[PDB]
Scaffold this active site. Structure first.
Site, mmCIF file in Angstrom:
data_model
loop_
_atom_site.group_PDB
_atom_site.id
_atom_site.type_symbol
_atom_site.label_atom_id
_atom_site.label_comp_id
_atom_site.label_asym_id
_atom_site.label_seq_id
_atom_site.Cartn_x
_atom_site.Cartn_y
_atom_site.Cartn_z
ATOM 1 N N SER A 44 0.751 -1.261 0.000
ATOM 2 C CA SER A 44 0.000 0.000 0.000
ATOM 3 C C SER A 44 0.777 1.304 0.000
ATOM 4 O O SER A 44 0.195 2.368 -0.230
ATOM 5 C CB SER A 44 -1.026 0.022 1.145
ATOM 6 O OG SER A 44 -2.068 -0.909 0.871
ATOM 7 N N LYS A 47 0.455 3.607 -2.971
ATOM 8 C CA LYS A 47 -0.658 4.520 -3.178
ATOM 9 C C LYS A 47 -0.219 5.985 -3.186
ATOM 10 O O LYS A 47 -0.875 6.833 -3.802
ATOM 11 C CB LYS A 47 -1.756 4.266 -2.131
ATOM 12 C CG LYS A 47 -2.386 2.849 -2.243
ATOM 13 C CD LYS A 47 -3.574 2.702 -1.288
ATOM 14 C CE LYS A 47 -4.343 1.403 -1.471
ATOM 15 N NZ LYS A 47 -3.676 0.239 -0.883
ATOM 16 N N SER A 104 -6.492 3.531 2.857
ATOM 17 C CA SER A 104 -5.905 2.451 2.064
ATOM 18 C C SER A 104 -6.991 1.671 1.322
ATOM 19 O O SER A 104 -6.908 0.446 1.156
ATOM 20 C CB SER A 104 -5.069 1.505 2.953
ATOM 21 O OG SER A 104 -3.897 1.090 2.255
ATOM 22 N N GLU A 140 -4.704 -3.515 -7.693
ATOM 23 C CA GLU A 140 -5.082 -4.082 -6.406
ATOM 24 C C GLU A 140 -6.003 -5.249 -6.748
ATOM 25 O O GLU A 140 -6.834 -5.149 -7.650
ATOM 26 C CB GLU A 140 -5.876 -3.083 -5.559
ATOM 27 C CG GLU A 140 -5.126 -1.810 -5.209
ATOM 28 C CD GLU A 140 -3.962 -2.042 -4.258
ATOM 29 O OE1 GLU A 140 -3.337 -1.043 -3.854
ATOM 30 O OE2 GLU A 140 -3.673 -3.202 -3.916
ATOM 31 N N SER A 211 0.709 -3.367 3.929
ATOM 32 C CA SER A 211 0.717 -4.731 4.444
ATOM 33 C C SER A 211 0.460 -5.673 3.270
ATOM 34 O O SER A 211 -0.333 -5.354 2.378
ATOM 35 C CB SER A 211 -0.393 -4.885 5.496
ATOM 36 O OG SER A 211 -0.626 -6.240 5.833
#
EC number: 3.5.2.6
Length: 262
Positions: A44, A47, A104, A140, A211
């Site tokens: 993440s 991002k 997230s 994702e 994560s």
């Protein structure tokens, strides 16, 4: 080499994983690195680059951030705390950016990636701002598989610290956009147990956590210590087994070693 680097080695040794750290102290532009040139799965933390790339586009399109984007049932992926409330409705690019960075939200990230024309569009923006290391290869949620040895969706601590400095404290983005990015990062809701857990409470900061599989636990932050120039800190951590548990405490420990070493 350094005492700080030696403490980080000791932490890594009893951590059961591989640790990557990169600190830039803007007080003097010095750097402290640990496995600073090794690649780690970004998960993440990627991002930040996607949101920044959209902010860059908004520099020549004043209404871009207000542009609505349709959210369909099929767009929902594995974690979409914000987007699920807008299925069959719309979210603006500013809303998607805030959702991606502060919560997230994965559907939100996918919309940012699509707005940039795919993962390669994020990589292209990275290259445009001087980052020759960063690479986004997937959307994702597969960009987070974090398989050891896999170069996809990785970067190095040194590269990410430099890019985060340029985005938040430098001139990679226009003034208004740089301020918006910092505002979003400072409003993150997921970082209290990571880098910030290892810093004095008075220090204010903005960060983006990550994560993934292999117990991958990451965090990248811009920090404003009390009474001194800001710091940019990146802490990446990944483990040998695919189902390993997250270890945000290792990131906090690394941050504490860095803070005590200043």
């Amino acid at each position: 080499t350094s005492a700080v680097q030696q403490k980080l080695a000791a932490l890594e040794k009893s951590s059961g994983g591989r640790l990557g750290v990169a600190l830039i102290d803007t007080a003097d532009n010095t750097q402290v690195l640990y496995r600073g040139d090794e690649r780690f799965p970004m998960c993440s933390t990627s991002k930040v680059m996607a949101a920044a790339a959209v902010l860059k586009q908004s520099e020549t399109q004043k209404q871009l951030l207000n542009q609505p984007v349709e959210i369909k049932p099929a767009d929902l992926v594995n974690y979409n705390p914000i987007a699920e409330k807008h299925v069959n409705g719309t979210m603006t690019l500013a809303e998607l950016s805030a959702a991606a960075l502060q919560y997230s939200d994965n559907t939100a990230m996918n919309k940012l990636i699509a707005q940039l024309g795919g993962p390669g569009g994020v990589t292209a923006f990275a290259r445009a701002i001087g980052d020759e290391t960063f690479r986004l290869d997937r959307t994702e949620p597969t960009l987070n598989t974090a398989i050891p040895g896999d170069p996809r969706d990785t970067t190095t601590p040194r590269a990410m610290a430099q890019t985060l400095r340029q985005l938040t404290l430098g001139h990679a983005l226009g003034e208004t956009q740089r301020a918006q990015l910092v505002t979003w990062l400072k409003g993150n809701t997921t970082g209290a147990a990571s880098i910030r857990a290892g810093l004095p409470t008075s220090w204010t900061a903005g960060d983006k956590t990550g994560s993934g599989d292999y117990g991958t636990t990451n965090d990248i932050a811009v920090i404003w210590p009390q009474g001194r120039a800001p710091l940019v800190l990146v802490t990446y951590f990944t483990q040998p087994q695919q189902n390993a548990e997250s270890r945000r405490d290792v990131l906090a420990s690394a941050a504490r070693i860095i803070a005590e070493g200043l």
